Motif scaffolding. Structure first.
Motif, PDB file in Angstrom:
ATOM      1  N   UNK E 100       4.853  -1.066  -3.116  1.00 54.13           N
ATOM      2  CA  UNK E 100       4.723  -0.765  -4.551  1.00 54.13           C
ATOM      3  C   UNK E 100       4.285  -1.954  -5.387  1.00 54.13           C
ATOM      4  N   UNK E 103       0.680  -2.388  -6.955  1.00 55.85           N
ATOM      5  CA  UNK E 103       0.210  -1.758  -8.182  1.00 55.85           C
ATOM      6  C   UNK E 103       0.255  -2.703  -9.375  1.00 55.85           C
ATOM      7  N   UNK E 264      -8.861   9.851   1.025  1.00 54.61           N
ATOM      8  CA  UNK E 264      -7.699   9.224   1.677  1.00 54.61           C
ATOM      9  C   UNK E 264      -7.773   9.252   3.191  1.00 54.61           C
ATOM     10  N   UNK E 265      -8.564  10.157   3.767  1.00 55.08           N
ATOM     11  CA  UNK E 265      -8.710  10.199   5.218  1.00 55.08           C
ATOM     12  C   UNK E 265      -9.167   8.852   5.763  1.00 55.08           C
ATOM     13  N   UNK E 267      -8.808   5.640   4.457  1.00 57.72           N
ATOM     14  CA  UNK E 267      -8.002   4.443   4.250  1.00 57.72           C
ATOM     15  C   UNK E 267      -6.499   4.662   4.343  1.00 57.72           C
ATOM     16  N   UNK E 268      -6.031   5.904   4.466  1.00 50.36           N
ATOM     17  CA  UNK E 268      -4.590   6.132   4.476  1.00 50.36           C
ATOM     18  C   UNK E 268      -3.953   5.688   5.788  1.00 50.36           C
ATOM     19  N   UNK E 273      -0.349   4.120   1.542  1.00 48.85           N
ATOM     20  CA  UNK E 273      -0.476   4.799   0.257  1.00 48.85           C
ATOM     21  C   UNK E 273      -0.873   3.825  -0.844  1.00 48.85           C
ATOM     22  N   UNK E 274      -0.460   2.566  -0.734  1.00 48.79           N
ATOM     23  CA  UNK E 274      -0.659   1.576  -1.781  1.00 48.79           C
ATOM     24  C   UNK E 274      -1.859   0.672  -1.535  1.00 48.79           C
ATOM     25  N   UNK E 277      -7.015  -0.210  -2.912  1.00 47.75           N
ATOM     26  CA  UNK E 277      -7.784  -1.324  -3.460  1.00 47.75           C
ATOM     27  C   UNK E 277      -8.036  -2.384  -2.396  1.00 47.75           C
TER      28      UNK E 277
END
Lengths: 300, 257, 92, 106, 303, 101
Positions: E100, E103, E264-265, E267-268, E273-274, E277
């Motif tokens: 987190x 962000x 998201x496929x 880079x997830x 999730x974070x 970037x």
């Protein structure tokens, strides 16, 4: 301590402002910080100011000068309308561009002395940029400086006879150049107007970077169409362009070839009707105004 | 500040995931990570504004009609939808952490199965589930949400949204993907919706919609990829609809007592 | 810099004869135009037909029209209500 | 200084009503903070942290460094909003009145 | 399907610095297999015509949308992985996963630059990027931010407007017609295409069918038009047209030069999730500007 | 009639921002009420710092502070400081005695 807390309080965050709340001159940008209160606090006349705002106020936005006064009132106006001008500019999606092709002020560019070749233009701007200075405080820039500059005489009486002795024995055309550079070189270390109060770029009106295209279900948008109003029924006197009121901004409208016949018909009530315009470009002037150029798209 | 809600039996969820749907890693992505990601972004978007004191459901309604607040609307809609999905797929809403309850047999209620027959021309729940799986595969090319909703006329129907589309407010359902081609019938639906929004007299240009969700399925990659993989989202939707928590889904249907 | 002039303590804050905007009667202006129209184009001239028709309607029931001919100023009510708050008097 | 250089930052409404001053746990090594908006005060507090940590000596240099961090965050938010609107319209989102339309009606 | 294969993407091998072995499988290999199957289950000409042909042949039809959705999803994905070479940055599988706290980090895309086109010899591409975007820091920021903003599936494209809005003898001279006026950035969502010639006007065309159909039903009813339905439909049509016109004419096309995937496929699996970037930062440090300069049309020096 | 008096219409300058209230009559009245010669300072030599007594041989400048008949304007009208008003009046009286004003 209480003093530390106070300095960081939300009231401290608002910069001191005594500019007239009722100004009838030319407005180019916001002058007062908009204050907003939530609906729950508005129901209790709470705005985070010193005193309760009168219950008559139904708006949730105000601008103020003084928390309290000798008249036992708050000096405030219940308006917040400069925010809608900014948001309407954002909706028009026209990035602000430099008509002089200057570097983007919001990027940390590696600049060089290309424009520093005007050392005598700006080193003297400190004493010559005194358009609105007192007749004696500006005169204090003559003796106060003279002593400071006169304290570097020994340094320049040795450097000049050690780095450019020929000029001292031939001509002063180059000596004057070595003087302008000397003071600046000995002034860059100093702090004269180290903080510049001039508006930086757009001033915060838009942080949009030029280049992006607007995708739409009907394809990429090539021309931005915005409803507007024509203010005058006769072109601005001495100018080949009329004036329009588009999204809280006054623009210069250029017509394709002819002026629509509704102009003559409507006359001085032309502002009563809405036309469609195309926003060609948007520029920023040094006064902090936005130079918006439009085009009266007419049904064809 | 918007914080991630605490879930019942969270220790079990962080160890054995959600049985029959997601693993421990899969649930950490969908909820413990994505919900944190959404709430933090929502707080950054709304802190210092009046919206900070409103719950996500109210934020989306307040911002549904504001074009330049779509970013806030998307975050609020996603946050609300994700907890609607995580709530009806959860083993038990009650916290049997100290009761160590391992017997949660929840089945569709009579009111739910009566409204299914009424609204789907006598189709059974099993058939409706097949239609739901089909609708998700053919109407949601990428991210989105699958909902079973109830309208003001007591009729249950199926709604699919693209990306973060709210079921509550039809102007923002995002059920038609305009990147691809649309039929004349779909354009008629969009044209009719635009006319309804123009009949409203409010200065905010907002309409009244009383649709409410009953079942929510997250069709985002954050929910299925890790456990099912690209292309296996129909196996994910089948498992979700077969292991729903019907204590929550039954409570979402208004009874009137 | 603009010189502020501060009054001494006063027994009252009152306007002797508060100014009021008395809107002009619509029927009287209609009559004033018709009379002028007859002065230029002549009496009963066809050019003043519309004026005659409008005047008749304005005066049909009441010669001065049906108007809310009542307006009063409230400055003295507010001045007496707010004077003690805004006069800047020192504390007792 | 900040609001003289950026007059339009004044047009961004500020809420003076406090929540709880005692709860503010801010690490000013970064500009963004959970609980408060990004605004001029974010720049000022960042500048003070730089001068307090002695990373920069002159206040002007610390201020300029903070200003650029502020521009970067402002540009990322201006794009997230433009793109979010564009993406929603591409999936069939409908809006009654736009800001430009609201102004015309008034 | 070797028809959808790249020489730098080898099964079992990771694109060093951007994708791991498990991340390149899921991202590209496991993804092309699905899209190919769906395209082969919708049209029998999949293995016959080029992808770009299917995209520009079955377009604007609601009955062939699934052929064009899968066709344009596989084209965009290939065009995205084609310009990627890798970086010297630590492998994604060996770095800690961003949490987190990511962000709250300030992006430094307005102060520093890295892997500029000119540094590798592509001098004509750097001049074009500076001319259209002002500088390469502005271009990088406007490119990473536009992709980061995309919530779900989509692509951020570096396009070049084609200065052939005449439509006369169009697409007859592979050089006179391949001329670019200015470069731009464009975002496409789900299975959207960056060309804009095969889809511009779709809503206007469908809008005119709807009005005519409604006007013909009104005639059956026997109505006297309307006070503002002829002035509202006219305005809606006049705006639809004026917003799709070109500088000279109404044939505005775009030449794909680069494409960054936002789905998201991609880079997830490796970044979490974070870490979108972080993914976009390593993507910028993995772009082979040679391939992009190659695609660049020749400048239209009408000036 | 397609014509309106200038006193009943406001002409919004170019480059300025406006609110819907700027098209109302209240704006017209508000602009009249708060209409002061505040731009004089920048065009007022005597409000710049010069000594008005140095203009005693320049009747053209001094004639800007007298009425049509030559009556020196009260400080309430000129807006000068006490010293400049005092010096300006002396300059005008000296100018009158020399035979120039």
């Amino acid at each position: 301590t209480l003093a530390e807390l106070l300095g960081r309080s939300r009231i401290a965050q608002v910069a001191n402002n005594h500019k007239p709340l009722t100004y009838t001159g030319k407005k180019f940008h916001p002058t007062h910080q908009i204050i907003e209160t939530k609906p729950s606090t508005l129901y209790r006349q709470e705005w985070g100011l010193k005193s309760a705002i009168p219950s008559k106020i139904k708006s949730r936005y105000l601008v103020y000068n003084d928390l309290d006064t000798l008249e036992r009132i708050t000096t405030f106006e219940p308006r917040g309308g400069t925010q809608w001008n900014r948001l309407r500019f954002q909706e028009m999606g026209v990035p602000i561009v430099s008509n002089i092709g200057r570097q983007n002020p919001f990027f940390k560019y590696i600049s060089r002395p290309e424009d520093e070749s005007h050392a005598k233009l700006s080193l003297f701007k400190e004493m010559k940029g005194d358009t609105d200075i007192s007749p004696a405080a500006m005169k204090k820039r003559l003796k106060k400086i003279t002593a400071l500059i006169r304290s570097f005489q020994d340094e320049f009486k040795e450097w000049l006879v050690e780095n450019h002795p020929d000029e001292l024995k031939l001509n002063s055309n180059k000596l004057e150049d070595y003087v302008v550079k000397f003071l600046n070189k000995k002034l860059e270390t100093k702090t004269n107007k180290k903080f510049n109060t001039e508006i930086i770029g757009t001033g915060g009106l838009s942080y949009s970077l030029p280049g992006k295209l607007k995708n739409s279900p009907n394809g990429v948008i090539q021309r931005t169409v915005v409803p507007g109003r024509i203010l005058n029924v006769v072109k601005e006197n001495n100018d080949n362009k009329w004036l329009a009121a588009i999204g809280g901004f006054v623009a210069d409208v250029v017509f394709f070839q002819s002026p629509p016949s509704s102009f003559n018909s409507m006359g001085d009530f032309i502002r009563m009707k809405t036309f469609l315009f195309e926003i060609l470009e948007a520029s920023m002037e040094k006064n902090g105004s936005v130079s918006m150029h439009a085009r009266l798209l007419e049904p064809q | 500040i918007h914080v991630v809600p605490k879930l019942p039996n969270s220790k079990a969820l962080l160890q054995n995931g959600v049985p029959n749907i997601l693993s421990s890693s899969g649930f950490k992505t969908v909820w413990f990570d994505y919900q944190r990601y959404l709430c933090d972004k929502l707080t950054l978007a709304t802190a210092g504004q009046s919206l900070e004191s409103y719950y996500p459901f109210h934020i989306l309604l307040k911002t549904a009609g504001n074009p330049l607040q779509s970013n806030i609307f998307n975050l609020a809609s996603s946050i609300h939808n994700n907890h609607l999905f995580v709530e009806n797929i959860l083993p038990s809403a009650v916290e049997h952490g100290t009761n160590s309850n391992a017997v949660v047999k929840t089945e569709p209620s009579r009111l739910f199965l009566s409204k299914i027959k009424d609204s789907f021309n006598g189709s059974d729940w099993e058939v409706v589930k097949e239609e739901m799986i089909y609708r998700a595969e053919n109407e949601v090319l990428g991210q989105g949400w699958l909902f079973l909703v109830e309208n003001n006329e007591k009729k249950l129907f199926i709604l699919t949204s693209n990306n973060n589309g709210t079921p509550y407010y039809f102007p923002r359902n995002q059920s038609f993907d305009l990147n691809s081609a649309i039929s004349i019938d779909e354009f008629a639906t969009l044209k009719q919706m635009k006319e309804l929004i123009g009949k409203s007299t409010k200065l905010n240009g907002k309409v009244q919609d009383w649709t409410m969700p009953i079942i929510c399925v997250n069709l985002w990659d954050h929910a299925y990829l890790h456990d099912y993989g690209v292309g296996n989202r129909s196996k994910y939707v089948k498992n979700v609809l077969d292991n729903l928590n019907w204590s929550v889904v039954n409570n979402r249907i208004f009874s009137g007592i | 810099k603009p010189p502020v002039y501060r009054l001494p303590p006063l027994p009252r804050l009152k306007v002797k004869k508060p100014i009021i905007r008395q809107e002009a009667n619509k029927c009287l202006v209609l009559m004033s135009n018709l009379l002028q129209c007859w002065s230029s184009y002549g009496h009963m001239s066809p050019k003043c037909a519309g004026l005659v028709t409008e005047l008749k309607s304005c005066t049909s029931e009441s010669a001065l029209g049906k108007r809310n001919n009542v307006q009063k100023s409230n400055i003295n009510y507010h001045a007496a209500r707010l004077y003690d708050r805004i006069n800047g008097k020192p504390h007792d | 200084l900040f609001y003289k250089q950026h007059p339009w930052e004044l047009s961004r409404p500020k809420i003076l009503v406090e929540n709880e001053i005692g709860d503010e746990n801010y690490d000013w090594s970064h500009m963004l903070q959970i609980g408060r908006p990004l605004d001029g005060e974010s720049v000022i507090q960042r500048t003070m942290y730089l001068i307090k940590t002695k990373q920069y000596g002159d206040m002007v240099e610390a201020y300029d460094h903070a200003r650029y961090e502020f521009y970067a965050l402002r540009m990322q938010e201006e794009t997230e909003q433009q793109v979010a609107l564009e993406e929603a319209e591409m999936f069939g989102s409908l809006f009654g009145v736009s800001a430009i339309e609201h102004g015309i009606q008034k | 399907s070797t028809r959808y294969a790249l020489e730098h993407l080898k099964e079992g091998a990771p694109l060093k610095g951007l994708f791991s072995i498990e991340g390149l499988q899921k991202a590209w290999f496991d993804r092309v297999k699905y899209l190919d199957a769906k395209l082969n289950d919708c049209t029998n000409e999949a293995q016959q015509k080029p992808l770009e042909t299917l995209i520009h042949e079955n377009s604007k039809s609601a009955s062939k949308k699934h052929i064009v959705n899968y066709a344009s999803s596989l084209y965009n994905l290939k065009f995205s992985m084609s310009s990627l070479q890798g970086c010297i940055r630590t492998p994604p599988e060996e770095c800690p996963r961003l949490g987190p706290e990511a962000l709250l980090q300030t992006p430094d895309f307005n102060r520093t630059i890295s892997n500029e086109p000119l540094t590798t010899g592509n001098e004509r591409l750097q001049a074009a990027l500076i001319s259209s975007f002002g500088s390469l820091m502005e271009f990088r920021t406007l490119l990473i931010n536009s992709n980061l903003a995309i919530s779900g599936d989509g692509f951020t494209w570096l396009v070049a407007r084609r200065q052939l809005d005449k439509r006369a003898m169009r697409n007859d001279m592979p050089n006179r017609d391949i001329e670019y006026d200015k470069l731009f950035i464009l975002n496409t969502y789900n299975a959207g295409t960056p060309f804009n010639f095969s889809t511009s006007g779709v809503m206007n065309e469908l809008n005119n069918q709807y009005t005519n159909m409604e006007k013909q039903r009104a005639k059956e009813a026997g109505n006297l038009e309307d006070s503002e339905m002829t002035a509202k439909q006219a305005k809606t049509k006049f705006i639809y047209e004026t917003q799709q016109k070109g500088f000279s004419g109404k044939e505005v096309s775009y030449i794909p030069l680069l494409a960054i995937d936002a789905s998201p496929k991609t880079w997830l699996t490796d970044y979490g999730v974070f870490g979108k970037r972080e993914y976009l930062e390593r993507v910028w440090d993995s772009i082979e500007w040679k391939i992009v300069e190659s695609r660049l049309p020749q400048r239209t020096k009408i000036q | 009639t397609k014509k309106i008096d200038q006193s009943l219409s406001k002409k919004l300058p170019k480059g300025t921002i406006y609110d819907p209230f700027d098209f109302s009559m209240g704006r017209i009245h508000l602009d009249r009420k708060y209409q002061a010669n505040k731009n004089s300072n920048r065009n007022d030599i005597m409000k710049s710092g010069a000594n008005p007594l140095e203009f005693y041989a320049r009747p053209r400048i001094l004639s800007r502070y007298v009425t049509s008949t030559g009556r020196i304007q009260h400080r309430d009208i000129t807006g000068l400081s006490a010293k400049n008003q005092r010096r300006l009046s002396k300059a005008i009286r000296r100018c009158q005695a020399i035979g120039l004003m």
